[PDB]
């Protein structure tokens, strides 16, 4: 089994952290 | 003695034929074991080597 | 075998043929756009033997066949071989008949009009499809990824399209159609593997190289550093097993091939690479558009599946792009097959059921009708 | 028997998300 | 005996002629390819005595005859003697007149064209056969063996051609003709038996050595190991009883004769052997053909009778052959008779009844017609 | 024996070697690329007898030697045997020591890296050459012809490389490497001469057929019409005298051989022929390049000496080319010696003295240096 669990969890976490980070950055950057 | 020797030669020829078939099947099974093993060990070495960031 | 007159959806490209029915989330089957023909004289009698083989048949019997792809960098020229591919796709795989289902096919926004007209003509005249609709690959790529705004980076086997779309509208002056594709990478890899002592020039050899590329290749985030180590040590080499038991060990060719996407000069192309075309397609758009397009560069098609490709393009675009603004690449797992999915999405929209060419309008006007009815 | 790459980064990327999410809420409250 | 106008089938080499009626699994008559002539002055009268003897007649009265064969290294050099052999075989033994039956004759694809023209001409002009076809020996060997794909190593009396076929198609660029056959193996043995003190040079003597070879020799799985023992111990000698009651014992010479198949230098030939040609014919086949031919290398014709040859050949090919791939040699019971059997299979196919040259087309064009009509 | 420290020029191919001194207009030492070895057991003693023979020695004593070629399809496979060819060529025939004569070697543009570095290594470590250079045959062909632009068809014994150059610059994306060469044409002739009753397989026989091809074969401008008469009448036959006083008479085989250049399927090759590859080398270059390459189609190397080939090619490219456009072939009598001539021109060029790798740079970097310094 290739890491199927990871392929999707990877997409989930990269997207969720990137979105959360984009929110963190905007939340402050908006001033 | 000949009929018995022919029985043995033909018995054995029929049996060796079956054994040869067993080898052909066995090797295909072997290849499946090796190929699936190879595919799994390698798909993981590569899946984990590329999928390192999570 | 379907219990409803669902549209059939198929992406008939220069590489693969993807097909399934509208409403699903994936093609049911995928196979190469190949029609093969014997290149040898027969000597045994009562052997059956076809004049031509299609798809997986063409590859299965390829030892004595020359294999041709009817679609040339996105356009259909050998419509007779494609009739065979469609018949196989529909009847021997999906087990559907276009006569009982409307059919959706797709092409890039700057694809020559001849492609849309010929696809329309054959599906109506040889398959008797009740309706047709030629979709835009860029439209389908963003439907599958979930965007109304973004850049379609469809970097597959045929051609890279590079089109900005904003709020569902095309921004066509900024399209950078580029003659750089997965098909060129296969031939380039055959040439650099020749440099290593393993020459590849024939169809069988080309299919072997396409398999090497698909299984061993990547681009990497930093090319020069990956190159420096791959060129210096066996630690970055990977072997490949050929159909005849030969083994080829591949080093920096593993990425030097794919790197052509960022450095097209490797194959003699006058281009700055896919990251610059993405960048310029955004830079040619208004500043109130650019803020949304830079944050939504969207991957579709093959080659987008290479390790380091989304990071490599995002890095280069970010380097070329202004600060403060965020630059991002969207590269979902539904890669390489996402345009098919977009086709399913379009085919099944209620807002799309008025977009079909019916087999009435078609015969009154002829196939040129697609040029006015689809988009 | 987790592969370190997957265990360590899944947790770190999960944390980037959680931390960024909290930062977004915090910074948004400030801004 | 035959109750239908079936095709006649007849395989003709420098060794023996096999013949029978199409549809059977065996020839019904087998004769030596020999025409004998007396070399003495008669003194008694009213003794009968022929001007020439054919087949079994030639061997039965051989004590005072010189024996000659019509076929050399695959071709007919003496058409008159072939007519006598076929006349006897068809009319006296099989009790059939070819005038009422189509006839199938055989050759490998590189056989000089004169051979196919002579086979066609004799049957149409001296036998008045209503139809003719010349088939490929490799084609017939694969039918007999139950294959459409494989390499036929026809290690007969005259010439070995080693012809590769895939899906019933010729791969002619890869036919590696070899100037080594059973007739040369006999000559090697005559010279080595001379070293042992037994000179064999006249017709009766030449026939004895050929008979010794066929009954006493084997290849030897390991030549050097078999020789280390055979050269050291009398326990490996086999005793052959000569026609006059005297005996000859043969030791390592028992295997050094067939060893020429793996060592052609033994008879002055610039070749490594039958396993080398087996390997080269497959080596030049398409990379996507090789896997099916390596798993199906086929023994055909005689010399394959060596109970040492089955393992000797697979070991020698496996040693040169690619890894991963299954390497296998087919050594069917239809050996030494595979061409005739394949001939019956081809001749009796419904799909083959349109392949015949008729005795209309023949007279309008002449025997050169076989070159355009058969393959 | 030379009066200047001028670099040697040595065009070492899979066929023959043309060697001489830079600055002259012709090679001085021409040898086949052959190393011969005895295949027989000696009986007399005090007969001299070498372990190996080279060049002309290999051919002069060939009656009992097996002859091998150290170079195959453009590369050295046996560098020890090339050291033997080089030692003889340099010290006995050219009568020069490489120690004071840098020496230019030749290669094809997509030739494996291993060959260019191995040639460099032998000259620096075995011959102690003060400097080295490995040249592109296409470059040399264009210098000899008085051009900086054109398609070089280097159609020799090994590989046809089909390589375009414009304004002195390589256009590598358009190189069409083709696996069809003079060695295959020889093999094809051996097979069709077998069809005529004259099988050729051994070293003496292989050398004879190559000589037959060079002396008797041609292409002419129309294969089918030439075949229609050659196959019907003795009026198009030519006799060749074999070394023992016997002769062979050859008919349409005389043109069917070289026709493989236009019909590669004759040897089982998946190719449309040399004119298709010439065409693609022109066509795959930019539209403002194409006109100059059409007007400068350059014949170089072997096979360019088949009667009718320069015009046959101009006709065959014209047939694929757009109308109005002028397609022109450059085919001087200095055909095939043009690579040697260019080697002389380049090696002695003042503008190219800095291009030589010295035996300083060589040891610091190793033989792979040729890949970075020559082009
Ligand atoms: N493992 C892989 N990595 C990168 N690309 C791949 C991989 N597997 C398949 N592809 C490529 O996908 C391409 C198929 O073209 P495709 O993108 O599906 O057409 P389209 O542009 O309409 O979407 C081929 O060039 C193929 O080599
Ligand atoms: N036991 C054996 N040992 C050696 N050779 C054999 C044996 N049995 C058969 N052969 C050889 O079979 C040959 C004749 O049959 P065949 O090969 O079918 O002729 P062909 O195929 O060329 O038409 C003879 O050379 C004979 O010596
Ligand atoms: N008249 C001719 N007919 C056919 N082939 C020729 C003729 N003259 C030369 N050639 C072929 O030239 C080939 C030698 O290849 P070549 O181009 O000279 O390699 P290189 O450039 O390294 O010397 C041989 O196969 C030879 O038969």
From Swiss-Prot, chains A, D:
It is found in: Cytoplasm, Cytoskeleton. It comes from the Eukaryota. Transmembrane segments: none annotated. Residues 3-31 are annotated as: Disordered. Residues 14-31 have a biased composition (Basic and acidic residues). The modification N-acetylmethionine is found at residue 3. Detected in primary breast cancer tissues but undetectable in normal breast tissues in Sudanese patients. Isoform 1 is expressed in adult and fetal skeletal muscle and cardiac tissues, with higher expression levels in the cardiac tissues. Isoform 10 is expressed in adult and fetal cardiac tissues, but not in skeletal muscle. Belongs to the tropomyosin family. Binds to actin filaments in muscle and non-muscle cells. Plays a central role, in association with the troponin complex, in the calcium dependent regulation of vertebrate striated muscle contraction. Smooth muscle contraction is regulated by interaction with caldesmon. In non-muscle cells is implicated in stabilizing cytoskeleton actin filaments. It is linked to Cardiomyopathy, familial hypertrophic, 3: A hereditary heart disorder characterized by ventricular hypertrophy, which is usually asymmetric and often involves the interventricular septum. The symptoms include dyspnea, syncope, collapse, palpitations, and chest pain. They can be readily provoked by exercise. The disorder has inter- and intrafamilial variability ranging from benign to malignant forms with high risk of cardiac failure and sudden cardiac death. Cardiomyopathy, dilated, 1Y: A disorder characterized by ventricular dilation and impaired systolic function, resulting in congestive heart failure and arrhythmia. Patients are at risk of premature death. The molecule is in a coiled coil structure that is formed by 2 polypeptide chains. The sequence exhibits a prominent seven-residues periodicity. This is Tropomyosin alpha-1 chain.
From Swiss-Prot, chain B:
The modification Phosphotyrosine is found at residue 31. Detected in primary breast cancer tissues but undetectable in normal breast tissues in Sudanese patients. Isoform 1 is expressed in adult and fetal skeletal muscle and cardiac tissues, with higher expression levels in the cardiac tissues. Isoform 10 is expressed in adult and fetal cardiac tissues, but not in skeletal muscle. Changing residue 53 to A: Loss of phosphorylation and decreased formation of actin stress fibers. The modification Phosphoserine is found at residues 22, 41, 53. It comes from the Eukaryota. Phosphorylated at Ser-53 by DAPK1 in response to oxidative stress and this phosphorylation enhances stress fiber formation in endothelial cells. It is found in: Cytoplasm, Cytoskeleton. The molecule is in a coiled coil structure that is formed by 2 polypeptide chains. The sequence exhibits a prominent seven-residues periodicity. It is linked to Cardiomyopathy, familial hypertrophic, 3: A hereditary heart disorder characterized by ventricular hypertrophy, which is usually asymmetric and often involves the interventricular septum. The symptoms include dyspnea, syncope, collapse, palpitations, and chest pain. They can be readily provoked by exercise. The disorder has inter- and intrafamilial variability ranging from benign to malignant forms with high risk of cardiac failure and sudden cardiac death. Binds to actin filaments in muscle and non-muscle cells. Plays a central role, in association with the troponin complex, in the calcium dependent regulation of vertebrate striated muscle contraction. Smooth muscle contraction is regulated by interaction with caldesmon. In non-muscle cells is implicated in stabilizing cytoskeleton actin filaments. Belongs to the tropomyosin family. This is Tropomyosin alpha-1 chain. The lineage of its organism: Eukaryota, Metazoa, Chordata, Craniata, Vertebrata. The gene is TPM1.
Curated annotation (Swiss-Prot), chains C, E, F:
InterPro entries: Actin, Actin/actin-like_CS, Actin_CS, ATPase_NBD. It is an enzyme of class 3 (hydrolase). GO terms for cellular component: actin filament; actin filament bundle; cell body; cytoplasm; filamentous actin; filopodium; lamellipodium; skeletal muscle myofibril. Oxidation of Met-44 and Met-47 by MICALs (MICAL1, MICAL2 or MICAL3) to form methionine sulfoxide promotes actin filament depolymerization. MICAL1 and MICAL2 produce the (R)-S-oxide form. The (R)-S-oxide form is reverted by MSRB1 and MSRB2, which promotes actin repolymerization. Can be mono-ADP-ribosylated on Arg-177 by SpvB of Salmonella spp. This modification blocks subsequent polymerization and leads to cell death. It holds the Pfam family Actin. Polymerization of globular actin (G-actin) leads to a structural filament (F-actin) in the form of a two-stranded helix. Each actin can bind to 4 others. Interacts with alpha-actinin. Identified in a complex composed of ACTA1, COBL, GSN and TMSB4X. Interacts with TTID. Interacts (via its C-terminus) with USP25. Actins are highly conserved proteins that are involved in various types of cell motility and are ubiquitously expressed in all eukaryotic cells. This is Actin, alpha skeletal muscle.
